[PDB]
Symmetry: C5
Subunit: 213 residues, 5 copies
């Protein structure tokens, strides 16, 4: 009932900008920042079986908490939209991306009165992954690994939260069999740091395939 009180929203934005530290990780209770990531695939635009590359569009549902941003919403809006330039956002990258992430949507996040932040850009991006079997019944399984680029596991944990039937375009030349998203840890022989990431396994295949029976 108080959502549409403009002055209240303006004051909330003011409060957020006073407290927000866009360049500092919001670690609370001496624990790493728990970042949840879930990709909702919207389309598969191009796949190349020779080069093992895919071109896809997905909604990157990204959530985390910063309780320093919280406010009492007993008589004020429960949520507001905030430009991400005013907020800290996780420095996520896909390890096997071969193009820049192209953000297709307005760069606004939602901040909830309990301090939860939700940012969900629609991203088009190209990846190097296993496209073998895309023209078969069992299809291909393209794996995409996403994690913090510069923050190791003691600082940020990136965690997962389907056939994406609610999201995936019915007009794609491909169809999604299954999308699994699992916790994964990465370490390199040179160095002690581990990186937490989510491994997204996209199992898909070409629609209306012609087979030899």
């Amino acid at each position: 009932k108080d959502d549409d009180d403009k002055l209240d929203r303006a004051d909330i934005l003011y409060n957020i900008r006073q407290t927000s530290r866009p360049d500092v990780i919001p670690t609370q209770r001496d624990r790493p920042v728990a970042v949840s990531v879930s990709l909702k695939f919207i389309n598969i635009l191009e796949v190349n079986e020779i080069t093992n590359e895919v071109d896809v569009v997905f909604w990157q549902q990204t959530t985390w908490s910063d309780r320093t941003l919280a406010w009492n919403s007993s008589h004020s809006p429960d949520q507001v939209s905030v430009p991400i330039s005013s907020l800290w956002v996780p420095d996520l990258a896909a390890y096997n991306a071969i193009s820049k992430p192209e953000v297709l949507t307005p760069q606004l996040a939602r901040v909830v009165s309990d301090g939860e932040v939700l940012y969900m850009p629609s991203i088009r991006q190209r990846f190097s992954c296993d496209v073998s079997g895309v023209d078969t019944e069992s299809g291909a399984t393209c794996r995409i690994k996403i994690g913090s680029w510069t923050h190791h596991s003691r600082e940020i944990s990136v965690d997962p939260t389907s056939d994406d039937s609610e999201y995936f375009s019915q007009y794609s030349r491909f169809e999604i069999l299954d999308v699994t998203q699992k916790k994964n840890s990465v370490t390199y022989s040179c160095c002690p740091e581990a990186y937490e990431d989510v491994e997204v396994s996209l199992n898909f295949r070409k629609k209306g395939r012609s087979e030899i029976l």
Copy 2:
């Protein structure tokens, strides 16, 4: 055309404008009217079900806090959109960034109405089958606020049906049979919020 009046109006708008806060008046959602006027259909890819199009995105809404008495001053001024709140519209089936081809200025009217109408080039995933037939193809584009649900913003059409004869290029390979624009509400199973959108059905065919 009184320059000092215009400068003062712009000053006033910038003193009052809150570019990041939705202009909810009373305790109601912001009513955003959107109407796409198609100008060109550049490419139609039957292999991939994709279209590349150019359209004017006629967008209007009110912010009465911007209003002024224009009895003896200009009725409207042009304002850079960076000085204004503008709705965070996005097309759900866009597969490229909206490319704005025109100067990023809005008109503000002395009654507080704002008109923003970018020319946009953008690619979409949609049903392209039938494009070379009498019935044509019907490509549906859903547009709405990306982050504001129905209690905060309503996105509504103006003209429900039009052949865009005043807008669409006579030199295109294609012709417009009908552009239908209707209110549409989207909810996802995961969450309670609804998003109020305009569903734009672009029915077009290859000229022959």
Copy 3:
């Protein structure tokens, strides 16, 4: 003889930045701002007769006046270069452009002591226009329509030049195409919905494949 007086130039630039209102149309008295636009074609890069599209490069000579910027040049520079971010510039758009105007050149304008402003970017841009006849002796005639995007005729008037040429001084000798004629006609656009009229110049590019 005072053009290269550096302190003079710095002071002129200072004065312009004190006076200039980059977001307000420089209307003088009770009249629209008169804007002249002349396209000088450098090249025609690609033409598609099936889709009726062209890819061109041109110098967009744009002139207007803001008398509030004028100064007494009797013992100072006649002109200076000014970043366009410091100036009001006409919000011109090509109504049949199908790509963003790509500016190839430094974004500087000239301001003359009498208040004339000249901005002439080199632009690469694609258009939807009539390419029919490009392979004939008479060639194709592609019309490019340019006017203010948000200012109607009471606020900005776009006045065509009286020039008639094949742009021999500008156009690449090595283009696959040849320009037969480039002309401009004043035109006014109105839509049935609304009373406002928008002034434009229609630039007619008559060209053919060599």
Copy 4:
């Protein structure tokens, strides 16, 4: 390590770095050149054009140097923080044979270590003019990439390799059309007969080949 998640500590370190940092001045200590270490970890080879002698590749550019004025005592505070590169001096590296801008695929953050070490490792997609002859043979092609400071000569910046040899097995995509045989990185000093200054660069030699070189037809 126990203090890594102390948020106020991190904010204060960032403030300190921003008070001390001179983003446009080389961090010369004593009167010695800034020692810049560079190591390219190749991830993908996207395109190899045998007609034109061009390659399009993705690599992680591991770049390290020291600015001891940024150091702090981390006995009871975070050992490292992430910092936007706009707040830091970064070496003005360029590849002499690049034919496209470096496209940075990742967030533009560096790590600053409490001893003053800085680590910046962007993933970069870039195109190069190099020798691709032999890519379809057993011995492969060897594409050499020369990287150095664009405007600082050897008295001001030295650009040196880290690891001499590797097949990048931990980094290179197993799904590429190509496979890496060896990546060698050597110091190289370049002077032009016109002028006296020398530029101290790294020559990166990427020896790679197409998989499945024996085809039917």
Copy 5:
């Protein structure tokens, strides 16, 4: 003294206090003398159908601004400076058909005597006669570089009075000339001083 950091910071501070990035550094009420020399690095994406060519070149650009000079008897002789802190000539390739792609860090060198050197590596496309590219006589590209907005009374742009070209280009250079040229248009009285660069090349073989 070159690697004295505080000295370098102070020089940068001094340059920024005196630099007027938007005002031409005309001295003695004479035009700014800008010297330009292109070093060709590569010839790429040559299209014989469309008569277009990509070139990569280092654009060696020098001029002086004596107000930037300092006494370097006990301090650095030279420093690197972001070009945003300096006036730089507004050079353009008048005839180019693509945006210049600057491939290198946008830093200039400032010498203690006030000399400035800026040398971007640039990739850019041009309209050229490519018809003879596979013949002994070859193809020709003409590139005209000058100030975009400053005429000859304000800026003079003159040519400076195998080490660089890629050994892996498909093409080889037959000749390069870089000549003083003054460009005037029938419509208007101003002349623009430019360097006319003629690049003659052919496919190897």
